[model samples]
Target: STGSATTTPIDSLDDAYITPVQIGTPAQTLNLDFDTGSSDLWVFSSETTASEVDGQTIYTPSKSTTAKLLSGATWSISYGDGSSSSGDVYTDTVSVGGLTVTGQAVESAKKVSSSFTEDSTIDGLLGLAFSTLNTVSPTQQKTFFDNAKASLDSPVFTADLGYHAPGTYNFGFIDTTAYTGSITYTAVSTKQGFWEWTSTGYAVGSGTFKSTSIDGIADTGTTLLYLPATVVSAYWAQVSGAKSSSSVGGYVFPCSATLPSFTFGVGSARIVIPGDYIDFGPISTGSSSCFGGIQSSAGIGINIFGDVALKAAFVVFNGATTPTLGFASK
Candidate 1:
């Protein structure tokens, strides 16, 4: 069955776009973060301890007649920011938008770190990355996309995320009218279980685009854009009064200071993130200074083309063929 649907964002806090996913036989819905950096469909569940859960809905395998426990199978994951989750596994029907995939590996949480328990709004994570990254034991599990691909019109999904607003996660078909200008595409490297690719160059504000190409991942799970140490330092240098703030963390500049725009090259297309987008709001509550979202990727491992970089344009996550990324103005 060839079908398509759009996601509804619950809201954007810390730049995360949460969408609804329907799981199980009769359809138990939950708000899930569609993360490209990860590849497991995990949700908070009855297996989680009471002390470890707060303001989050828990999925019960018993409630879903279609769910079957995967004996001896378990999973655990740690994120770049140290947030972690671990649990047992179940094979269930997981549906996103209007598409459905049966026998999808659904990891149910037995435990979660404080960071995850604290984020009450996001109930679970729907990993859109390659299936090879699934963390279940015994045998690696296939992602919902890979499991559903054969029945799909096209093995593709699109992420149209917005800044502090609503956006969509589309499946099966590309809406040509969703973006402006022709979509510019770049081949993605999946060796790291990410939509990782090489960009031609980048520049801060009106500065010249550097000739050095950057190998990075387009991660919707991340809130900010993280580049190499020198690249971040270069961009910060262009903003007068900008400096690293230990208390506030990262680099911060005076609220009154004018910020510069940032542009990244994908093939021949130079997708620009406006100057205002660089201002990651206030450094703290009632503070006059604001922190810069573009920061050093030094400790973070790889360059992350996070939400800030993706929100500026519409993104096409092509699951079929060569696995390319198409970006265009929204």
Candidate 2:
């Protein structure tokens, strides 16, 4: 059997989660955002334009004896948030949580946006989604997990996210102790390079579960859960002074509004997102305004089960075959 590794997750900006990884011969250490929403492992590097490189730590391929150039290959990427990064490619030895993969494709940025340039903590993104989504040009790349998965004892990983607290990402093995009750399974629809699934139905508070099919994705990169407009409206209707804010761009509510738990159906199982999770903290601790984490996915064209909802449950990403998601209460 192959070995397994378990690492603690670091919360950043109350939105992103990061894990540590090492690259190159001498093992240059870096912090990486483990994003299941995208595919492509990229890093802030020496190749980046000076002005574009803000507070970020950069990786110097010249300093790493084990780094080799992937001739003529390059990569460029953009995000839903309008941030972007573009760079040349390198093949290096990359290690995460004790699991190592040699000759892994590591995109070293030649350009970046302020969104990434200002973040000194997150050095790069480690995409855990399918390798088919890799975005390199001339020759596409395979993500670290995709390169290392075949050697793992079991092709699976677990995510235990917490609210303003410590989370854990365990690879190659499932720790049953991390969750309670049975792990309910849901089939994945991967046509779009995401872990998309259909929820049988949903309900607010203790209301009866209404039967409807909701299609969306499980995105670790995004901070909040984005449901359909109708569903989002129903949630805010239960709270007074809760309305969509043009300035903040999402729904906002009085900090004192009583929130109800949001529940979604997964086959025969139900995952309940606590009311507190819906409160994405105060817009500013100075006043009574707070941002509602539950918003409409209307513009994005798909529902998003993001960190807010994910933190309320233990998630199993079965990368083995016929991809499935398993969820249980923490």
The candidate that wins on TM-score is 1
**lDDT for predicted candidate 2 compared with the true structure:** 0.84
Q: Which numbered prediction scores highest in lDDT against the true structure?
A: 1
* Candidate-wise lDDT, in order: 0.86, 0.84
Model 2 clash pairs are none
For candidate 1, the per-residue lDDT at 106 reads 95
Q: Candidate 2 vs. truth: CA RMSD?
A: 1.8
Error of 1 at 257 (Å): 2.6
Per-candidate clash tally: 0, 0
